[PDB]
């Protein structure tokens, strides 16, 4: 019901009051569809670096893991629900950024060269969205305290500003950098799980937030485990797709068609 | 068929020779669905400016018409199909931006203050995709000469900065600035559909690009005029949404639910 009599109205400001809040509309329409026993076997992989650049990217992720695992106390304590959600909550705020700068820079190339994209731009922009929905789900489990709330703001500034020039300078490095970051998302999200399953972790959020059920389409009775599993799936998807793009780049196949448009 | 055996593969670089170039995987699957006898009726409007900001927006958008008209000789000549296409082309290189720098920032804020964004980002993104898919369409109706190929780049610089900084200081000034450009746009495109009737201009490209056929889901019979008629209604979807956004800034409503997620 979107035709000219609507299109000719100047503003719809008076309709903000009457329209509802529906969890459904937080996301774009591009929802992940996983079936749990299938993705139940997603498993940790490690792609060989090739040049300097991969090796460079690869040190960057490992130099960063070793910082972040000490400063976030993560090791010195028996694992809990709490210290995990804080880890991820924090981790997903950078997980937004490259997904975005990604398309936003590919997008401006397309507009300025007057050329095709062949379906990269929307693939990335949803990698940005999915990583933001992770965050909108984790926020529901725990609001962070002023400490973290602040460190996010600095981090983001720093990260944004690395990632935009690292893209302009070397897309191959960034896709490669990200690919390596997700091998670590997969590692951890399987730890978390091994933990639940053995019992070393006992979860109290067996409710799964409204946003999280609709986004992922889960059962009304989906567990804390269930939710990690799909997030763990989502993290594997991105692992491939970037290491893919980095290879693609590596071989000057970076105006080729994005293979994953087909591969649905 | 996306599952745990494709998630566990390091790469897909070798699938990129076997994988088709199809015009329906350029855009996302978020394409307008107009019906032409209806969107035939779209009108020319004006929204009154309130403050300095609303007034200032209107001065720059007007002054930029005046200059680009006098610098593109739109006055001294005939309404030849040349400088109609050659015009939209250039101009969709800049329409591709506000949406992308707006969606970028709200994503970044959503992330960094962990707050729900309520259907703005995606709306704001597809606005830009849409505009790009005008330029893509036009690119097949006429390929531009180097002069204009440059003019375009040295312009994405000015405008990717301007819009970047304005949208921080005053997204309202931009969501109005855009709102007043679309006005001049939805004019210029009724100017051209008028002139195809009056018969002052006879469109020689009454083939419509396969890109812009899938996207707008037109016929194979559909004239140039019909293509204009849809593009024009897209531009009018924009005109009002951006004003509604500007107004939602004016009334401290920047974090209310997008009133177009429903009105879909
Ligand atoms: C200063 O900014 C940074 C600080 C640390 C990092 N890293 C810490 C953890 N990260 C891997 C990671 C581990 C994980 O257990 O979950 C993740 C996760 O859920 C993501 O979405 C992205 C990365 C990770 C490696 C580098 C990156 C940027
Ligand atoms: Fe993540
Ligand atoms: Fe991630
Ligand atoms: Fe336009
Ligand atoms: Fe426009
Ligand atoms: O435009």
Cα angle at A27 between A162 and A72, to 5 degrees? 45
- Quick check: B39 and B193 in contact, CB under 8 A? no
Structure tokens at B245: 């956004």
Pocket of ligand 1 (CB under 6 A): A 61, 64-65, 68, 88, 91-92, 94-95, 155, 159, 181, 184-185, 188
Query: Across the interface, do A244 and B6 touch by the CB < 8 Å criterion?
Result: no
Strand extents, DSSP E, B133-173:
none
Question: How far does the centroid of ligand 5 lie from the alpha carbon of residue A165, in Å?
Answer: 29
Does the annotation place B210 within a ligand binding site?
A: no
Nearest by CB to residue A128, choosing from B9, B20, B107, is B107
CA distance B244 to A15: 10
Experimental method: X-ray
Q: What is the DSSP letter of B259?
A: T
Distances (CA, A) of B107 to A193, B101, B125, B154, B184: 30, 10, 10, 27, 29
> Rounded distance, CA B195 to CA B203, Å?
10
Structure tokens belonging to residue A203: 């979860």
Number of domains forming the structure of chain B: 1
Q: B6, A139: Cβ pair inside 8 Å?
A: no
- Domain of B210, CATH number, reads 1.20.1260.140
CB contact under 8 Å between B93 and A104, yes or no, is: no
Residue B4 Cα to ligand 4 middle (Å): 42
Q: Are B89 and B142 in contact (CB under 8 A)?
A: yes
Q: What separation in Å is there between the alpha carbon of B2 and the centre of ligand 1?
A: 25
- Phi/psi at B4 (5° precision): -65, -15
Q: Which of B3, B5, B6, B7 to mutate to test the interface with A (most CBs of A within 10 A)?
A: B7
DSSP-assigned states of every residue in A18-48: TSPP-GGGGS-S------HHHHTT-----PP
How far apart, in whole angstroms, are the C-alpha atoms of residue B247 and residue B240?
10
Listed resolution, Å:
3.2
Give the range of the structural domain holding residue B81, as residue numbers without chain letter: 1-264
Cβ(B234) – ligand 6 distance below 6 Å? no
Ligand 1 site-directed mutation target among A46, A63, A64, A131, most atoms within 8 Å of CB: A64
Rounded Cα distance between B112 and B122, Å, is: 17
What is the CB neighbour count within 10 angstroms for residue B15? 14
**B64, burial (CB in 10 Å: exposed 0-12, middle 13-18, buried 19+):** middle
Evaluate: CB of B184 within 6 angstroms of ligand 6.
no
E strands in chain A = none
Q: What's CA A56's distance to the chain center, in Å?
A: 22
User: Among A18, A85, A96, A112, which would you mutate to test the B interface (most chain B Cβ atoms within 10 Å of its Cβ)?
Assistant: A112
């Amino acid at each position: 019901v979107w035709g000219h009599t609507q299109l000719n109205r100047l503003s719809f400001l008076e309709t903000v009051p009457v329209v509802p809040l529906r969890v459904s509309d937080e996301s774009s329409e591009d929802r992940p569809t996983w079936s749990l026993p299938d993705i139940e076997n997603v498993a940790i992989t490690h792609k060989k670096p090739n040049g300097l650049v991969d090796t460079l990217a690869y040190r960057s992720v490992r130099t960063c893991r070793w910082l972040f695992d000490t400063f976030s106390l993560y090791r010195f304590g028996s694992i809990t629900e709490s210290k995990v959600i804080s880890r991820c909550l924090f981790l997903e705020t950078v997980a937004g950024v490259p997904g975005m700068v990604g398309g936003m820079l590919r997008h401006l190339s397309s507009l300025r060269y007057m050329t095709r994209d062949k379906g990269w731009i929307n693939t990335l922009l949803v990698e940005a969205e999915n990583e933001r929905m992770h965050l909108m789900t984790f926020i529901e489990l725990r609001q962070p305290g002023l400490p973290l709330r602040v460190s996010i703001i600095i981090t983001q500034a720093i990260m944004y500003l690395f990632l935009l020039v690292a893209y302009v300078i070397s897309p191959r490095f960034v896709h490669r950098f990200v690919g390596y970051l997700e091998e670590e998302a997969v590692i951890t999200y399987t730890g978390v799980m091994r933990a639940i399953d053995e019992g070393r972790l006992r979860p109290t959020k067996n409710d799964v937030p409204e946003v999280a059920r609709v986004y992922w389409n889960l059962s009304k009775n989906a567990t804390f485990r269930d939710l990690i599993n799909v997030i763990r799936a989502d993290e594997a998807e991105h692992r491939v797709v970037n290491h893919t793009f980095a290879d693609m780049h590596e071989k000057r196949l970076q105006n080729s068609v994005n293979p994953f448009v087909v591969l649905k």
